[PDB]
Design a binder for this molecule. Structure first.
Ligand SMILES: Nc1ccn([C@@H]2O[C@H](CO)[C@@H](O)C2(F)F)c(=O)n1
Ligand SMILES: Nc1ccn([C@@H]2O[C@H](CO)[C@@H](O)C2(F)F)c(=O)n1
Lengths: 226, 227
C-alpha cells in the first residue's frame, strides 16, 4: 500500500480540517495522489462538512465517509442522541484499507479526539491507527494549555506504539503574542512542528490556499511521505 | 499523614481554583482540618493569586505557596521569562509533607495541566502525586472536547498508578444545554462525578459560597476523605 496518516486534534476548533486540506494541497502539488477519509462527521446541524471543506480548499476528489450526525458532540454522544449506532469497527478499518494504495497519501481525519469512541464497540481513532498501521499527525494550538494537551496526546500515542508524524499548529496568530511565541519554541522541543498555518487560512480561495499550503510545509518532508 | 489530593485541570480556566475553594469549604463544614497548597503560581504580574482567591471564597487561612512568576504562561516559560529557576522537586515535596498530618485534607492545586513541568528538571504534578501517594481530583468542563481531554488525563494518571479521586465539573450552566447534559452523562460513565459547580460561583459571597459548596458534594464522600 501507500501511506496512511491519522490527523487528530488536541482540542476542538483547532484547525484539524484546514490542516487536512493544507497537507493534501501540499502533497498534491508535489505530485502525490491524496485521499481524505472522515469516517464520522458530526455537527451537520450547524453545517459542518469537513470533506467538502477539503474538496473546496485542496481539490481532493477521493473523499470518503460513513456516517453524519446533526449534533455538535463526540460521535458516541451524537449517535446516542440520534438513536442510531456508530459505524462498526470493520466498516472503518476496511474503508481506510481500501482507500489505501501505492503512491497515495490517505489522511484519516478524526472526530472528537484521539481517545473517544469512533466506532462501536468502544473502538477509538487510536485503535484504528493501530489496525491500519498509520502514524498520527497531531494538530495543536499555540495557546495556553497546549503543552499539557500535546504531552498527553503523545503519551497516549506511545502507549499503543502509534508513531507520531509530528505536530501542526492549526492556526498561527498575527501578531503572535507572548504566550504563542513561547509555545511554538516549546512545542518544537517535544516533537517536530511540520507547519504553522496562518490564522484566517480557511477563508482563502483555492489558488491562495494552495499558495499558503505549498510554503507551509517542508517540501522534502511532504515528498518523503510517500 | 492525612489525605493529600492533587487538584488538576483538563485545560485552562476549567475552574480548578473554585473547585479547590468549594471542596475546602465543604470539608471545613464537615469539621475537617483543611490546608490548600499552590506550589507554583504564574501570572502574578497580572494579579493572579489562586491561594488568595481560595481564602476569599472559602475563608481558608491555612494557605501555602512557594514559587511565584510574573508572566501568565506555563511555569517553565514563566520562570525563564523572569530569569528564574523552577523549584526543585524536594522543595514542592517538603512543602506538602510539612502541611500533611493526620486528620487533615491537604489540597495541592496544580499550575497548567497534569503533565506540565512544575519543578526542575521535568518533574510534573503526576510525579509529585506519586512521591506523596496522593490521589488526583480532575477538574473538567461539560463542553465538546472534554471527553477526550478527560480520557487522556485518566490514562496518564493510571500509567503511573495515581488513583483518580473522581471528576468535578468546574462550571455547570443553568440551564444545561443538550451538549452539556450529554457530556455530563458520558463523563459519569468514565468516572465518579463528585460535583458540578454552578456557573458564576466566584461571585458568591462567603455565605452563599459555603452553602453552594455544602450542597455541591455528596456529604458521605467529603466526610470519608479523611479518617
Ligand atoms: N489556519 C486556520 C485555522 C483555522 N481557521 C478557522 O478557525 C476555525 C476554528 O478551527 C476553523 O473552523 C476555521 F478553519 F474556520 C482558519 O481560518 N485558519
Ligand atoms: N463554577 C465557576 C467556575 C468558574 N468561575 C469563573 O470562570 C473562570 C474560569 O473557570 C474562573 O476564574 C472564575 F472563577 F472566575 C466561576 O465563577 N464559577
Amino acid at each position: 500500500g501507500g501511506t496512511i496518516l491519522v490527523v487528530t486534534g488536541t482540542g476542538t476548533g483547532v484547525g484539524k480540517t484546514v490542516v487536512c486540506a493544507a497537507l493534501a494541497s501540499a502533497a498534491r502539488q508535489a505530485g502525490i495522489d491524496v485521499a481524505v477519509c472522515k469516517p464520522v462527521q458530526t455537527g451537520t446541524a450547524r453545517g459542518d462538512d469537513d470533506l467538502a471543506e477539503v474538496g473546496r480548499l485542496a481539490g481532493v476528489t477521493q473523499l470518503a465517509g460513513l456516517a453524519r450526525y446533526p449534533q455538535p458532540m463526540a460521535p458516541a454522544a451524537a449517535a446516542e442522541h440520534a438513536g442510531m449506532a456508530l459505524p462498526a469497527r470493520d466498516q472503518i478499518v476496511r474503508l481506510i484499507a481500501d482507500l489505501d494504495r501505492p503512491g497515495r497519501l490517505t489522511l484519516v481525519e478524526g472526530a472528537g479526539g484521539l481517545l473517544v469512541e469512533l466506532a462501536e464497540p468502544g473502538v477509538t481513532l487510536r485503535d484504528v491507527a493501530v489496525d491500519v498501521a498509520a502514524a498520527a499527525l497531531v494538530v495543536v494550538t499555540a495557546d495556553l494549555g497546549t503543552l499539557n494537551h500535546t504531552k498527553l496526546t503523545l503519551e497516549a500515542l506511545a502507549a499503543q506504539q502509534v508513531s507520531c508524524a509530528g505536530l501542526v499548529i492549526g492556526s498561527w496568530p498575527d501578531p503572535p503574542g507572548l504566550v504563542a511565541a513561547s509555545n511554538r519554541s516549546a512545542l518544537a522541543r517535544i516533537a517536530m512542528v511540520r507547519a504553522a498555518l496562518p490564522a484566517g487560512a480557511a477563508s482563502l480561495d483555492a489558488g491562495d490556499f494552495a499558495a499558503m499550503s505549498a510554503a507551509a510545509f517542508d517540501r522534502n518532508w511532504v515528498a518523503g511521505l510517500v
